[PDB]
């Protein structure tokens, strides 16, 4: 078998946006195997070594203003530029979530499941209500799952002690819709 | 914070593999084909709204190699510590018999970025319809990756996402069958 050791090199230019394109932070990072050696934080304004392995580079690059100028100006020419380039289909991309409620195949008490899938973006708010009022306790989430195809899914359970007549609602709040989505479970 | 666009690249020795891709809030926008030297978009649609001079990524990757050599040498050739992947198999949406659905094999938190993935339907490899993504960056510098198998739910079938990675002592088979 292949036993030769590997040597990896990674480079990441991360553009962080806050309030649209109001405040931008560029984070340039070099990673040797699984450790970040050098980096450029636009907030700092120059390279800083993250490990001694990175010192030669931080010191070296910082000795070239032509270079640093380009880098300082990147929050604009690079970050904001790219942001706008794909804002129509990324920042503004919206896909309504499919919601359905059905009892779990587990669980006396009845375990209710609220499946919310195929939605985008990821910020989503799902809550359980009982006869019109929030249900803080009992809830259990699967967490937000990223499918890798610009689509998200999640499951939110709600343990209950059902009574004929009761109504348990799974409310969903998401950017793709103006008013919240609701799916009730008639007890 | 609201959004993060990441340009992620890497070069690996001695497999001499490389990657160059952009990422939006976790999702891949596109990556360059090092062989065909052309931009391939995560979603066909994007290619109609923007472009990228693919040919240019190859240059960064060249510098990337040179850089790896340098680092490799000044670290006294400290090899990479393999980290086995967390593997999970889920459905694209809630499953219901004969209702077409997609199996997603989540390969997460691993390194180096070299892995072998195979789909198994009743102990036998499935090919048709399957698709996979390139390597996705992680805050901890390990990788993510997704493999896809569209299928037709049934009671009789049992699938496996067979994963191979150096950090694993033996092939890992994540079992998945209809249980609803």
């Amino acid at each position: 078998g292949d036993t030769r050791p590997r040597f990896l090199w990674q480079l990441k230019f991360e553009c962080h946006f806050f309030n649209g394109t109001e405040r931008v932070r560029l984070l340039e990072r070099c990673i040797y195997n699984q450790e970040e050696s050098v980096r450029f934080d636009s907030d700092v304004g120059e390279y800083r070594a993250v490990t001694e392995l990175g010192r030669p580079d931080a010191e070296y690059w910082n000795s070239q203003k032509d270079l640093l100028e380009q880098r300082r100006a990147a929050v604009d020419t690079y970050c904001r530029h790219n942001y706008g380039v794909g804002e129509s289909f990324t920042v503004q991309r919206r896909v309504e979530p499919k919601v359905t409620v059905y009892p779990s195949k587990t669980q006396h008490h009845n375990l209710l499941v609220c499946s919310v899938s195929g939605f985008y973006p990821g910020s989503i708010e799902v809550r359980w209500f009982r006869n019109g009022q929030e249900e803080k306790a009992g809830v259990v989430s699967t967490g937000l799952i990223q499918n890798g195809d610009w689509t998200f899914q999640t499951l939110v359970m709600l343990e209950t002690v059902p009574r004929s007549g009761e109504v348990y609602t799974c409310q969903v709040e998401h950017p793709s819709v103006t008013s919240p989505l609701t799916v009730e479970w008639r007890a | 914070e609201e959004h993060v666009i990441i340009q992620a690249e890497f070069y690996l020795n001695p497999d001499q593999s490389g990657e160059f891709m952009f990422d939006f809030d976790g999702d891949e926008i596109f990556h360059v084909d090092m062989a065909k030297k052309e931009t391939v978009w995560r979603l066909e649609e994007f290619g109609r709204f923007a472009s990228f001079e693919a040919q240019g990524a190859l240059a960064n990757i060249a510098v990337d190699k040179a850089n790896l050599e340098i680092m490799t040498k000044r670290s006294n050739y400290t090899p990479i510590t393999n980290v086995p992947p967390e593997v999970t198999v889920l459905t694209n949406s809630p499953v219901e018999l004969r209702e077409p659905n997609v199996l997603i094999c989540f390969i997460d938190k691993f390194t180096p970025p070299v892995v072998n993935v195979t789909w198994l339907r009743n102990g036998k490899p499935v090919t048709t319809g399957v698709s996979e993504t390139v390597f996705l960056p992680r805050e901890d510098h390990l990788f993510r990756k997704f493999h896809y198998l569209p299928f037709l739910p049934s009671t009789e079938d049992v699938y496996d996402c067979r994963v191979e990675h150096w950090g694993l002592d033996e092939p890992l088979l994540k079992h998945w069958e209809f249980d609803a």
């Binding site: 480079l11 230019f13 340039e28 030669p56 580079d57 010191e59 070296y60 690059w61 270079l67 990147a74 020419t77 690079y78 530029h81 790219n82 706008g84 380039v85 794909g86 | 340009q7 690249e9 952009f22 926008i29 596109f30 709204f49 923007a50 472009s51 990228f52 001079e53 240019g56 990524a57 240059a59 960064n60 510098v63 990337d64 040179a66 850089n67 340098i70 680092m71």
Partner: peptide
């Protein structure tokens, strides 16, 4: 609209 890249710098030698 065109995506632009950041050029990779060469390490200190």
């Amino acid at each position: 609209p065109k995506y632009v890249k950041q050029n990779t710098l060469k390490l200190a030698t």
